Design a protein around this nucleic acid. Sequence first.
RNA 1: UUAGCUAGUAGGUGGGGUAACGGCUCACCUAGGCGACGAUCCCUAGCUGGUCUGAGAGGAUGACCAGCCACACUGGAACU
RNA 2: UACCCGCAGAAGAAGCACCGGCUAACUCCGUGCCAGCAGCCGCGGUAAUACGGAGGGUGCAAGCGUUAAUCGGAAUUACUGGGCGUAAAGCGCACGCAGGCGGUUUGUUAAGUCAGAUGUGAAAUCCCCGGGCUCAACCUGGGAACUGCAUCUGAUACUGG
Lengths: 156, 123, 82, 32, 80, 129, 205
Amino acid sequence: ELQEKLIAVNRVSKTVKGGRIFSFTALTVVGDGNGRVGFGYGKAREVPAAIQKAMEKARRNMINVALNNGTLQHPVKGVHTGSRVFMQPASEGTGIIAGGAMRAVLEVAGVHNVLAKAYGSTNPINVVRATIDGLENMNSPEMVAAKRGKSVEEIL
Amino acid sequence: ATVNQLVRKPRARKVAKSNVPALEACPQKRGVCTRVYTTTPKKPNSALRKVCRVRLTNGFEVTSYIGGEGHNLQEHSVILIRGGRVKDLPGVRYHTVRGALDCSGVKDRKQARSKYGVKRPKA
Amino acid sequence: MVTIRLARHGAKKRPFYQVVVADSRNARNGRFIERVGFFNPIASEKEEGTRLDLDRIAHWVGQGATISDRVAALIKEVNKAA
Amino acid sequence: AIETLLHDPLFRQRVEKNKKGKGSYMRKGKHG
Amino acid sequence: KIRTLQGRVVSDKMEKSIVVAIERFVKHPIYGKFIKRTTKLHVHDENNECGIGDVVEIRECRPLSKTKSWTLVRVVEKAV
Amino acid sequence: SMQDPIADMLTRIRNGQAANKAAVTMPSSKLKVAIANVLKEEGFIEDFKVEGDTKPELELTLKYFQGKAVVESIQRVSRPGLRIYKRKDELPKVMAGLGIAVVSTSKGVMTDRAARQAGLGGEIICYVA
Amino acid sequence: ARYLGPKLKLSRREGTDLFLKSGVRAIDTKCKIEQAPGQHGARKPRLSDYGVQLREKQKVRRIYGVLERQFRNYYKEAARLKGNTGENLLALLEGRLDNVVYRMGFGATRAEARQLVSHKAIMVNGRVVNIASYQVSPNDVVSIREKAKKQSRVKAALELAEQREKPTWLEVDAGKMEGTFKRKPERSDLSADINEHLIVELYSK
RNA sequence: UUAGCUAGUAGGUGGGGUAACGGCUCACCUAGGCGACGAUCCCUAGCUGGUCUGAGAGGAUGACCAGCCACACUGGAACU
RNA sequence: UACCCGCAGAAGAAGCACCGGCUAACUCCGUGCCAGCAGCCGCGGUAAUACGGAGGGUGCAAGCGUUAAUCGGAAUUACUGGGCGUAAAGCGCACGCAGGCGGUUUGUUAAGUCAGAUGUGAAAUCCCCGGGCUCAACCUGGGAACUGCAUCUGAUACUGG
Ligand SMILES: [Mg+2]
Ligand SMILES: [Mg+2]
Ligand SMILES: [Mg+2]
Ligand SMILES: [Mg+2]
Ligand SMILES: [Mg+2]
Ligand SMILES: [Mg+2]
Ligand SMILES: [Mg+2]
Ligand SMILES: [Mg+2]
Ligand SMILES: [Mg+2]
Ligand SMILES: [Mg+2]
Ligand SMILES: [Mg+2]
Ligand SMILES: [Mg+2]
Ligand SMILES: [Mg+2]
Ligand SMILES: [Mg+2]
Ligand SMILES: [Mg+2]
Ligand SMILES: [Mg+2]
Ligand SMILES: [Mg+2]
Ligand SMILES: [Mg+2]
Ligand SMILES: [Mg+2]
Ligand SMILES: [Mg+2]
Ligand SMILES: [Mg+2]
Ligand SMILES: [Mg+2]
Ligand SMILES: [Mg+2]
Ligand SMILES: [Mg+2]
Ligand SMILES: [Mg+2]
Ligand SMILES: [Mg+2]
Ligand SMILES: [Mg+2]
């Protein structure tokens, strides 16, 4: 019951006296189709192993996200390193309007409707992180009410 | 950057010049083959790439690449150039249209025929 | 002078006329003072083919404006209907 | 005009790029 | 109940005439800053009552000269 | 020099929130006081106390819920360099209605929602998320 | 303006049964439905993000027998209309006259239905309609005209339909050969496997 | 990488002229007027409703249709 | 003329681009840094999914490709919406006119600001709800919109005087 998407796999090298030692990084993400999402970044000498590692990493250190129905609660910006990332809640039926790495994270999270742009860098690893941050910071109405000492009716 | 600054002196749009200026915003132009000759490309490539120096209708002397396997162009042969620059070649910014004016279609070609001015074979 | 007249505005072979107050010198479909109704000869059953803002027309007439023959006819028809 | 013919870039000494040796390293293969 | 503009008198050298700068506090189209833009006007005044640096109220009228199509209605704060 | 006082106040508040300070004092002004009151009403601060005769100090008491701050973000919108006025239809919704936008209207300073209800726009002082 | 070629090939490509054949004979018997078409069928390459969406789009288009420009137009219309976009699009697709006919059971296949429509067989509120792309509104009775009522194909189609699952949103008479389009269908009435959302996404890049 | 420009020039008086106000024009008097909120000079260009693109803000554009302008072999001029 | 009815018989009616990655679609043969391809990265020097042909597929379809040109993507002139220690970017340092901005209280004014009304903002176009051509495009009724300008009547927190 946890859908998992491998966002990207990338070959990285460490030079040694002999020559180049290659290795593979694999950036995956997992989620339950509701709030919970986690990204994993696993590295190994062969790809499948790396992917597995990434998956494992994802499965621990998840994070919950308040979702008003199928979408976000209000427009949120998230940043991390180079990627800065805007994501705005949307009407039913619009789908996930978002690019690449960002899309994948959203999909697993179980947001079905978003308008989302990635400014700055689009380094998948950074962008996913940024997205996660954005999701995390985003607060629900109830939460806000609790914070402020009011009812959800009073805020609307 | 400052709003005041902007007001004083606003933001300049980066004026991008054309890469095919001898066309003069035309989709093709006619010209005559002043000379026709091979040229070697730059590194890393190797070839004898067929090119023609072309005096265009609008005064401009350009040099136009000649696509396809084989061609008929001589000096004083009227042809249609179209824009498109061969990358390996320094100074070439235009292709001849094959199958327009004196430039003939490519012989024996049976795929991408339209790009090489070739009619559909009857059988 | 100012005239009340038709102004061909439709498709090819399916003309829909607009009735307009307009200086006579101007072109048929060009500049006009006021659009005071319309007329549709290719009108189906169960729909108003013609409709004239009659008060406006009256006012224009008073002011001292001619009425095209067709427009006059239309007006008459409207009156009859009423 | 033979010397000039020999001179032309056409007839410049090509050397084949390595695949396993010194210039071995390709960042991206011919196919993914 | 007439359309009338205020403004300072920039100059009063030419006779039966003054030039009156009218300030207007317009919003910028793009940047949304509010700029003070200025409109010099050649205004007619019989008797030459206005001094320089003088605030003065003026109305629009039929053209009295080439450049002159505004006439003054009253003077205010003529201190030097 | 000091050019914007409201902005300064906002900044102070933000810093207090950051630094887990109980209270945040500053020189008082009427507008500032009004803003504080508005905030209190909306529930972003606990209390404000203006104190003094000759030179009175406003003293806000910041709010913390479950460790973290309540005033999550707080921006000056209009500012001396570049003012912003808004007609009642153009009034913003901060955080899609969860946050508030303090707006100075002819019937006093108030939250955006209040202004909307009234049926009047005005100068947009600050957003508070 | 139509796909005239092999029908089962398309189905194979898709993966699923597109109902491009009458449903007398099970699709497995007519073709290797699992294996994709061509020389490189057995190989199943891992499909891209764009690619899956594209495939989905094709599937829907294939099902209804709609070329691309028309499809695009439909999508645009859906977008314009109030409410969920994908759902709207689906509804629009359904609303097509030929589709309606097929649903009723006067054409074995959608293609057949389309053909019938073309060949002046289908009256819509007593007026012969020839356009397959015609949108059938609510409470629009839609019938075979008396000339085409005698055709053996029509009865066969009806029979086939009777075996198939009936749609709730129509109401059809086998004896009278006339059906009433009662209401535009809710998403729940249509097939669940269609990921309209993917299609929507595709037309936003 | 165009900084100064202007003597009917800016204003006044009085004649003349116009369907009409007006340096529109003439005579005399005053010495002004415009300009870094870009005058003057140079290059380009018919303007608008609109069109295309864009999430928008913008950007580009101004075929067709409609409004306005100017022109009618080139340069002048009047007559009716 | 549209439209309708009858007649015959699958009869008269499918192509163009692409298939190395970006980008949906892969194999065999020939050639072998040639011939050629190419939008970018690049491919080709005898096992080429990148050249040419074939078979197979993919995408569009009475069109399909190329070229030109505009906006987009380009937050790559950044008002919305960027930056300047080392990536391009802080005048060598000051004074200072014009300009921009301006602590705090009360009164007043009402210029900015906000509200409401009036006049205007041509028609068409765009958008909304409808109607008419078998459908559509197209035509079309009514609305909304035309973010503005001017005036009048209020409001006076904020800015200005
Ligand atoms: Mg970058
Ligand atoms: Mg067609
Ligand atoms: Mg929609
Ligand atoms: Mg005189
Ligand atoms: Mg006189
Ligand atoms: Mg943009
Ligand atoms: Mg001539
Ligand atoms: Mg002449
Ligand atoms: Mg592929
Ligand atoms: Mg090719
Ligand atoms: Mg061989
Ligand atoms: Mg080979
Ligand atoms: Mg090789
Ligand atoms: Mg090949
Ligand atoms: Mg571009
Ligand atoms: Mg831009
Ligand atoms: Mg930058
Ligand atoms: Mg350096
Ligand atoms: Mg530097
Ligand atoms: Mg320094
Ligand atoms: Mg102050
Ligand atoms: Mg006012
Ligand atoms: Mg108002
Ligand atoms: Mg209009
Ligand atoms: Mg209709
Ligand atoms: Mg004051
Ligand atoms: Mg005041």
